[model samples]
Target: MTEYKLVVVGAGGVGKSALTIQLIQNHFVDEYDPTIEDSYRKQVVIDGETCLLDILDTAGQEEYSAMRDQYMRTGEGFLCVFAINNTKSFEDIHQYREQIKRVKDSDDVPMVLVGNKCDLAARTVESRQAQDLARSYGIPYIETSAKTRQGVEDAFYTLVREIRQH
Candidate 1:
């Protein structure tokens, strides 16, 4: 089976772990873990083809900045996540996207712009604003809620599809 190396990146408190673990284990993490990184693997069928997804959930804290380039060098696709309720978190996605491209040395990197924590009633980032950003990057925009398990699969699956086409 083909394996897709997918990396999840965002600012702290943006629910990066929640989305990654939710996909692998179908459970949400309500608290943050200040670890270097967490990797998970699972087999899934996409477009009737069995695919192995090797997901790297990167640490969002600034102290782990030294380790980002290593993973960015190896990742095939990325889920650039941002919390809907946090405006600063959304702003941080631009840095994550640019850093990945700089390390990969390509402008055509595969990625999905993920707006996470959609279950929250109060949102600092609007759908149109996120859509505009994704459109500017020429990538797909997907809203997800790790707690409710909404659009979790779609975010990862779309990233794989982007990689496949790339």
Candidate 2:
């Protein structure tokens, strides 16, 4: 089976782990007091094609910026996430996209922009603004909430489709 490595990246507290865990295990992990760096491997079928998927839940802390180069280098597809509740995270898309291009040496890299914690969008950036930003980048925008499992499957499946297309 064809294997793809997709990295989940964004600012701290944006629910990267929750989203990954939800996708792989089909359930939400409550509470975030304890954090982890994990690589999840699974065989998932999308669009009638089966493939092995390796998803890395990246460190989102500011200090880990330098470390992200390694991830940017290795990842074949990316989910650039930001909590809808945090505008600062949204502002860093250029930096993240730049690093992805710098490391991968291609603008056609497969990627998706994700807004997490959609359930709390009341205290968050508007969906249109995020969609507009992704449109500027010519990337897809998806909203997800691990609690309700909203848009979680669509995000990863769309990403895999994008990657397969490329």
Candidate 3:
């Protein structure tokens, strides 16, 4: 079986852990504390192809920079998440992308730019802007809602397919 390491990165309260939980466990939580540490591995089968998915659900604070770098270095693919309701997180994408490139040592790393919390469209930050940024970086973009399970599977499988193709 092919093994893949995937990282979900973004600022705090952007639903990084929520997305990971929904994808791996098929569930979601309304209130999750950001200070908690959560990471795990999951095995998923896509189109009859089995692969081990090493998922690192990271904290969004700067204190975890070393841990984040370590995980980023091992990632074969990445899901850089941003909250549609938080414009600051969206703006921080540039920094996040730079950090990923520096730690992974490659600008060509297969990545998916995820604008999460689509279920709350009323509070959307900059959907179009986020999409445009992803487009400029040549990465796929999707707005996801972990609570409703919208685009959650696509966000992961799409990146997996892209990684396999490359």
lDDT to native, each model: 0.91, 0.84, 0.83
Model 2 segments beyond 4 Å from truth? 30-34
Report the C-alpha lDDT of model 1 over 40-128, residue by residue, as the tens digit: 89999988889899999998888877788877679999999999999999999989898899989999799999999999999999999
Model 1 residue 165 CA deviation in Å: 1.1
Question: How well does candidate 2 match the true structure, expressed as C-alpha RMSD?
Answer: 1.6
Ranking by lDDT: 1, 2, 3
Residue pairs in collision within model 1:
none
Which pairs clash in model 3? Answer: 84-125
Regions of candidate 1 where Cα sits further than 4 Å from its true position: 32-37
What TM-score does candidate 3 reach? 0.91
The regions of model 3 sitting more than 4 angstroms off are 32-37
Give each model a TM-score: 0.95, 0.92, 0.91
Best by TM-score: 1
Error of 1 at 137 (Å): 0.3
Instruction: Please give the lDDT score for candidate 2.
Output: 0.84
User: What is the full ranking by TM-score, best candidate first?
Assistant: 1, 2, 3
